[PDB]
């Protein structure tokens, strides 16, 4: 008998084993396993475990409804235990497994001691294959997102005219997609879904776990099935896509979701495929649902950024997780876990992450990662915290986004420059500072925004290495205007916030 073991982020009906064994349906058995040892590796958001395990159970029933014999092992101790016993029990001869998106997971699988032999199949959940990405990247020492993205537009024939020119007269509309927030404008609402019976049962199961976990269990409103995921997507496309562009980087107090799609957790489980998402987004444009700038804007986040991160996770060395270019080693402040800070920008983020396991991109980069970079925090710790707390989190996307984009911990392999910034950025692109007890225009004293002393001490401390990269000339000239007495005072100020967190 052939076995297929399907993993919790591979919930796709186009799993390759399901396409090849489709003639051999009566001689195949499908396994899915929930592993408590796996969940114990991080203090996971309660909604992450709810989401993943409810999506798994729903997917298993979907597969049965199509004729497949599916054995589901609930709340197992270990993959070793569950998988070995199932293999033994059903005399499985060949265990087909799709290459995990998270490369560290491969070691787990291939270390299992099993009566079956292992037959690896290629991951075909993303647009670019690992081999294709590697071939594209190999010729260059320095990679660039923009070029990769254009190559994507061509290979998948995305938003092109009949003569192969980019629709709207240019490849990239991002310059237009950085307006600050407009006073009084109310975002449209997030898609919400009431848990069904399966989901409810998992909520109860998570509720009673003894593992240390994070954040609120309820209300859980996330899509857990393909059909809900498609609904979420369709609603984003018909309501929000029309203004995704303008306020892409905007942050507003009290507004957790804004004009974002919130499909990443569903995409990252396999319930949606990146191409389908892109094709629907184009169709939306050809149905007059949104301007091209927002249309292209959205697509670039999947065709570009998302593909890029998956590719780099497998292209980079497997030691990339230890990148620490700045030699930062400070522990996270407890406020990352409790949310108890009076830095309003941070508090707002932590509040929504606690409540729904989600912050939007510009929060992740310009509030959270930015803070972690200028505060000198251990990159591994930050990365782990993001991985525990966000419902779209996996190694492939979090190693790259945190260590590459947010923290420049790889020294600029992924990004052009550090995204570090003082309160000038946050006050301009948000309304958070208005409701804050700190002043974004002060640098010293008890009422100064701590971002200011930290950013300027950050520059001072790494002045030499930043100088040698040579993309921060203008910013470093600013540092260079500060006398040694002024930078001493900034350092004392930074030292004070660090001790007071
Ligand atoms: N950590 C994560 C993570 O765990 N999972 C994840 O999918 N993405 C992370 N990012 C990148 C983005 O911040 C994140 O995808 C968005 O916040 C997800 O929310 P939403 O509302 O689904 O996103 P959207 O509508 O604005 O965008 C549409 C889709 O585009 C993809 N996308 C966009 N930008 C991306 C990306 N995928 C990978 N990488 C990047 N940079 C999504 O699939 C989305 O559905 C992340 C970024 C940063 C800066 C940190 C520090 C940590 C994480
Ligand atoms: O097959 C499973 N996959 C689970 N996954 C996802 C797997 O696909 C695996 O973590 C990936 O590393 C493989 O790409 C989880 C991911 C999390 O972030 C948190 C908890 C889980 C739990 C499971 C699980 O119980 N079973
Ligand atoms: S003042 Fe500083 S801490 Fe307070 S909100 Fe603005 S940036 Fe965030």
CSV table of N, CA and C in Angstrom, one decimal, residues 238-328:
chain,number,residue,atom,x,y,z
A,238,UNK,N,-13.3,42.9,-4.0
A,238,UNK,CA,-14.5,43.6,-4.4
A,238,UNK,C,-14.6,44.9,-3.6
A,239,UNK,N,-14.1,44.9,-2.4
A,239,UNK,CA,-14.3,46.0,-1.4
A,239,UNK,C,-12.9,46.8,-1.3
A,240,UNK,N,-11.9,46.1,-0.9
A,240,UNK,CA,-10.7,46.9,-0.5
A,240,UNK,C,-9.6,47.1,-1.5
A,241,UNK,N,-9.5,46.2,-2.5
A,241,UNK,CA,-8.4,46.3,-3.5
A,241,UNK,C,-8.4,47.7,-4.1
A,242,UNK,N,-9.5,48.4,-4.2
A,242,UNK,CA,-9.5,49.7,-4.8
A,242,UNK,C,-8.8,50.8,-4.1
A,243,UNK,N,-8.4,50.6,-2.8
A,243,UNK,CA,-7.6,51.5,-2.1
A,243,UNK,C,-6.5,50.9,-1.3
A,244,UNK,N,-6.0,49.7,-1.8
A,244,UNK,CA,-4.9,49.0,-1.1
A,244,UNK,C,-3.7,49.8,-1.3
A,245,UNK,N,-3.5,50.3,-2.5
A,245,UNK,CA,-2.3,51.1,-2.9
A,245,UNK,C,-2.0,52.3,-2.0
A,246,UNK,N,-2.9,53.3,-2.0
A,246,UNK,CA,-2.7,54.6,-1.4
A,246,UNK,C,-2.2,54.5,0.1
A,247,UNK,N,-2.9,53.7,0.9
A,247,UNK,CA,-2.6,53.6,2.3
A,247,UNK,C,-1.9,52.3,2.7
A,248,UNK,N,-1.1,51.8,1.7
A,248,UNK,CA,-0.3,50.6,2.0
A,248,UNK,C,0.6,50.7,3.2
A,249,UNK,N,1.3,51.8,3.4
A,249,UNK,CA,2.2,52.0,4.5
A,249,UNK,C,1.6,52.9,5.6
A,250,UNK,N,0.3,53.0,5.6
A,250,UNK,CA,-0.3,53.9,6.6
A,250,UNK,C,-0.6,53.2,7.9
A,251,UNK,N,-0.5,53.8,9.1
A,251,UNK,CA,-0.9,53.2,10.3
A,251,UNK,C,-1.8,54.1,11.0
A,252,UNK,N,-2.9,53.5,11.6
A,252,UNK,CA,-3.9,54.3,12.3
A,252,UNK,C,-4.2,53.6,13.6
A,253,UNK,N,-4.2,54.4,14.7
A,253,UNK,CA,-4.6,54.0,16.0
A,253,UNK,C,-6.1,53.4,16.0
A,254,UNK,N,-6.2,52.3,16.6
A,254,UNK,CA,-7.5,51.6,16.6
A,254,UNK,C,-7.8,50.8,15.4
A,255,UNK,N,-6.9,50.7,14.4
A,255,UNK,CA,-7.3,50.1,13.1
A,255,UNK,C,-6.3,49.0,12.8
A,256,UNK,N,-6.8,47.8,13.1
A,256,UNK,CA,-5.9,46.6,13.0
A,256,UNK,C,-5.6,46.1,11.6
A,257,UNK,N,-6.5,46.3,10.6
A,257,UNK,CA,-6.5,45.6,9.4
A,257,UNK,C,-6.5,46.5,8.2
A,258,UNK,N,-7.1,47.7,8.3
A,258,UNK,CA,-7.0,48.7,7.2
A,258,UNK,C,-7.5,48.2,5.9
A,259,UNK,N,-6.8,48.4,4.8
A,259,UNK,CA,-7.2,47.9,3.5
A,259,UNK,C,-6.4,46.6,3.1
A,260,UNK,N,-5.8,45.9,4.0
A,260,UNK,CA,-5.1,44.7,3.8
A,260,UNK,C,-6.1,43.5,3.7
A,261,UNK,N,-5.6,42.4,3.0
A,261,UNK,CA,-6.4,41.2,2.5
A,261,UNK,C,-6.5,40.2,3.6
A,262,UNK,N,-5.5,40.1,4.4
A,262,UNK,CA,-5.5,39.1,5.5
A,262,UNK,C,-5.5,37.6,5.1
A,263,UNK,N,-5.0,37.3,3.9
A,263,UNK,CA,-5.0,36.0,3.3
A,263,UNK,C,-3.7,35.2,3.6
A,264,UNK,N,-2.7,35.9,4.1
A,264,UNK,CA,-1.4,35.2,4.3
A,264,UNK,C,-1.5,33.9,5.1
A,265,UNK,N,-2.2,34.0,6.2
A,265,UNK,CA,-2.3,32.7,6.9
A,265,UNK,C,-2.9,31.5,6.1
A,266,UNK,N,-3.8,31.9,5.2
A,266,UNK,CA,-4.5,30.9,4.4
A,266,UNK,C,-3.6,30.4,3.3
A,267,UNK,N,-3.0,31.4,2.6
A,267,UNK,CA,-2.0,31.0,1.6
A,267,UNK,C,-0.9,30.1,2.2
A,268,UNK,N,-0.4,30.5,3.3
A,268,UNK,CA,0.7,29.8,3.9
A,268,UNK,C,0.4,28.4,4.5
A,269,UNK,N,-0.9,28.1,4.7
A,269,UNK,CA,-1.4,26.7,4.9
A,269,UNK,C,-1.5,25.8,3.7
A,270,UNK,N,-1.6,26.5,2.5
A,270,UNK,CA,-1.9,25.8,1.2
A,270,UNK,C,-3.3,25.9,0.8
A,271,UNK,N,-4.2,26.5,1.6
A,271,UNK,CA,-5.6,26.6,1.2
A,271,UNK,C,-5.9,27.5,-0.1
A,272,UNK,N,-4.9,28.3,-0.4
A,272,UNK,CA,-5.0,29.1,-1.6
A,272,UNK,C,-3.6,28.9,-2.3
A,273,UNK,N,-3.6,29.1,-3.6
A,273,UNK,CA,-2.4,29.0,-4.3
A,273,UNK,C,-2.1,30.4,-4.8
A,274,UNK,N,-0.8,30.7,-4.7
A,274,UNK,CA,-0.4,32.1,-5.1
A,274,UNK,C,-0.8,32.5,-6.6
A,275,UNK,N,-0.7,31.6,-7.5
A,275,UNK,CA,-1.1,31.9,-8.9
A,275,UNK,C,-2.6,32.2,-9.0
A,276,UNK,N,-3.4,31.5,-8.3
A,276,UNK,CA,-4.8,31.7,-8.4
A,276,UNK,C,-5.1,33.1,-7.8
A,277,UNK,N,-4.4,33.4,-6.7
A,277,UNK,CA,-4.6,34.7,-6.1
A,277,UNK,C,-4.2,35.8,-7.1
A,278,UNK,N,-3.1,35.7,-7.8
A,278,UNK,CA,-2.7,36.6,-8.8
A,278,UNK,C,-3.7,36.7,-10.0
A,279,UNK,N,-4.1,35.6,-10.5
A,279,UNK,CA,-5.1,35.6,-11.6
A,279,UNK,C,-6.4,36.2,-11.3
A,280,UNK,N,-6.9,35.9,-10.1
A,280,UNK,CA,-8.1,36.6,-9.7
A,280,UNK,C,-7.9,38.1,-9.6
A,281,UNK,N,-6.7,38.6,-9.1
A,281,UNK,CA,-6.4,40.0,-8.9
A,281,UNK,C,-6.4,40.7,-10.3
A,282,UNK,N,-5.9,40.0,-11.3
A,282,UNK,CA,-5.9,40.6,-12.6
A,282,UNK,C,-7.3,40.6,-13.2
A,283,UNK,N,-8.1,39.6,-12.9
A,283,UNK,CA,-9.4,39.6,-13.4
A,283,UNK,C,-10.2,40.7,-12.8
A,284,UNK,N,-9.9,40.9,-11.5
A,284,UNK,CA,-10.5,42.1,-10.9
A,284,UNK,C,-10.2,43.4,-11.6
A,285,UNK,N,-9.0,43.6,-12.0
A,285,UNK,CA,-8.6,44.8,-12.8
A,285,UNK,C,-9.3,44.8,-14.1
A,286,UNK,N,-9.4,43.7,-14.8
A,286,UNK,CA,-10.2,43.7,-16.1
A,286,UNK,C,-11.7,43.8,-15.9
A,287,UNK,N,-12.2,43.5,-14.7
A,287,UNK,CA,-13.6,43.9,-14.3
A,287,UNK,C,-13.8,45.3,-13.7
A,288,UNK,N,-12.9,46.2,-14.0
A,288,UNK,CA,-13.0,47.6,-13.4
A,288,UNK,C,-13.2,47.6,-11.9
A,289,UNK,N,-12.6,46.8,-11.1
A,289,UNK,CA,-12.7,46.8,-9.7
A,289,UNK,C,-11.7,47.6,-8.9
A,290,UNK,N,-10.6,48.0,-9.5
A,290,UNK,CA,-9.5,48.7,-8.8
A,290,UNK,C,-8.6,49.4,-9.8
A,291,UNK,N,-7.9,50.5,-9.4
A,291,UNK,CA,-6.9,51.1,-10.3
A,291,UNK,C,-5.7,50.2,-10.3
A,292,UNK,N,-5.0,50.3,-11.5
A,292,UNK,CA,-3.8,49.5,-11.7
A,292,UNK,C,-2.7,49.7,-10.6
A,293,UNK,N,-2.6,50.8,-10.0
A,293,UNK,CA,-1.5,51.0,-9.0
A,293,UNK,C,-1.7,50.1,-7.8
A,294,UNK,N,-3.0,50.0,-7.4
A,294,UNK,CA,-3.3,49.1,-6.3
A,294,UNK,C,-3.3,47.6,-6.8
A,295,UNK,N,-3.7,47.4,-8.0
A,295,UNK,CA,-3.7,46.1,-8.6
A,295,UNK,C,-2.3,45.6,-8.6
A,296,UNK,N,-1.4,46.3,-9.2
A,296,UNK,CA,0.0,45.9,-9.4
A,296,UNK,C,0.6,45.8,-8.0
A,297,UNK,N,0.2,46.7,-7.1
A,297,UNK,CA,0.7,46.8,-5.8
A,297,UNK,C,0.5,45.5,-5.0
A,298,UNK,N,-0.7,45.0,-5.1
A,298,UNK,CA,-1.1,43.7,-4.5
A,298,UNK,C,-0.3,42.5,-5.1
A,299,UNK,N,-0.4,42.4,-6.4
A,299,UNK,CA,0.3,41.4,-7.1
A,299,UNK,C,1.8,41.3,-6.8
A,300,UNK,N,2.5,42.4,-6.6
A,300,UNK,CA,3.9,42.5,-6.3
A,300,UNK,C,4.3,41.9,-5.0
A,301,UNK,N,3.3,41.9,-4.1
A,301,UNK,CA,3.5,41.3,-2.8
A,301,UNK,C,3.5,39.8,-2.8
A,302,UNK,N,2.8,39.2,-3.8
A,302,UNK,CA,2.8,37.8,-4.0
A,302,UNK,C,3.8,37.3,-5.0
A,303,UNK,N,3.7,37.8,-6.3
A,303,UNK,CA,4.6,37.5,-7.3
A,303,UNK,C,6.1,37.8,-7.0
A,304,UNK,N,6.3,39.0,-6.3
A,304,UNK,CA,7.5,39.5,-5.9
A,304,UNK,C,8.0,39.0,-4.5
A,305,UNK,N,7.6,39.7,-3.5
A,305,UNK,CA,8.0,39.5,-2.2
A,305,UNK,C,7.9,38.1,-1.7
A,306,UNK,N,6.7,37.6,-1.7
A,306,UNK,CA,6.4,36.2,-1.2
A,306,UNK,C,7.3,35.2,-1.9
A,307,UNK,N,7.3,35.1,-3.2
A,307,UNK,CA,8.2,34.2,-3.9
A,307,UNK,C,9.6,34.4,-3.6
A,308,UNK,N,10.0,35.7,-3.4
A,308,UNK,CA,11.4,36.0,-3.1
A,308,UNK,C,11.8,35.4,-1.8
A,309,UNK,N,10.9,35.4,-0.8
A,309,UNK,CA,11.3,35.0,0.5
A,309,UNK,C,11.4,33.4,0.5
A,310,UNK,N,10.5,32.8,-0.1
A,310,UNK,CA,10.5,31.3,-0.2
A,310,UNK,C,11.8,30.9,-0.9
A,311,UNK,N,12.1,31.4,-2.1
A,311,UNK,CA,13.4,31.2,-2.8
A,311,UNK,C,14.6,31.4,-2.0
A,312,UNK,N,14.7,32.5,-1.3
A,312,UNK,CA,15.9,32.8,-0.5
A,312,UNK,C,16.0,31.9,0.7
A,313,UNK,N,15.0,31.5,1.3
A,313,UNK,CA,15.1,30.5,2.4
A,313,UNK,C,15.8,29.3,1.9
A,314,UNK,N,15.5,28.7,0.7
A,314,UNK,CA,16.2,27.6,0.2
A,314,UNK,C,17.5,27.9,-0.6
A,315,UNK,N,17.7,29.2,-1.0
A,315,UNK,CA,18.9,29.6,-1.7
A,315,UNK,C,20.0,29.9,-0.8
A,316,UNK,N,19.7,30.7,0.2
A,316,UNK,CA,20.7,31.0,1.3
A,316,UNK,C,21.3,29.7,1.9
A,317,UNK,N,22.5,29.8,2.6
A,317,UNK,CA,22.9,28.7,3.3
A,317,UNK,C,22.0,28.3,4.5
A,318,UNK,N,22.1,27.1,4.9
A,318,UNK,CA,21.2,26.6,6.0
A,318,UNK,C,21.6,27.2,7.4
A,319,UNK,N,22.8,27.9,7.5
A,319,UNK,CA,23.2,28.7,8.7
A,319,UNK,C,22.7,30.1,8.7
A,320,UNK,N,22.0,30.6,7.7
A,320,UNK,CA,21.5,31.9,7.6
A,320,UNK,C,20.7,32.4,8.8
A,321,UNK,N,20.1,31.4,9.5
A,321,UNK,CA,19.4,31.7,10.8
A,321,UNK,C,20.3,32.3,11.9
A,322,UNK,N,21.6,32.0,11.8
A,322,UNK,CA,22.6,32.6,12.7
A,322,UNK,C,23.1,33.9,12.3
A,323,UNK,N,22.6,34.6,11.3
A,323,UNK,CA,23.1,35.9,10.8
A,323,UNK,C,23.0,36.9,12.0
A,324,UNK,N,24.1,37.6,12.3
A,324,UNK,CA,24.0,38.7,13.3
A,324,UNK,C,25.1,39.7,13.0
A,325,UNK,N,24.9,40.4,11.9
A,325,UNK,CA,25.9,41.4,11.4
A,325,UNK,C,26.2,42.5,12.4
A,326,UNK,N,25.2,43.0,13.1
A,326,UNK,CA,25.4,44.0,14.1
A,326,UNK,C,25.8,43.5,15.4
A,327,UNK,N,26.0,42.2,15.6
A,327,UNK,CA,26.4,41.6,16.9
A,327,UNK,C,25.5,42.1,18.0
A,328,UNK,N,24.1,42.1,17.7
A,328,UNK,CA,23.2,42.5,18.7
A,328,UNK,C,22.8,41.3,19.5
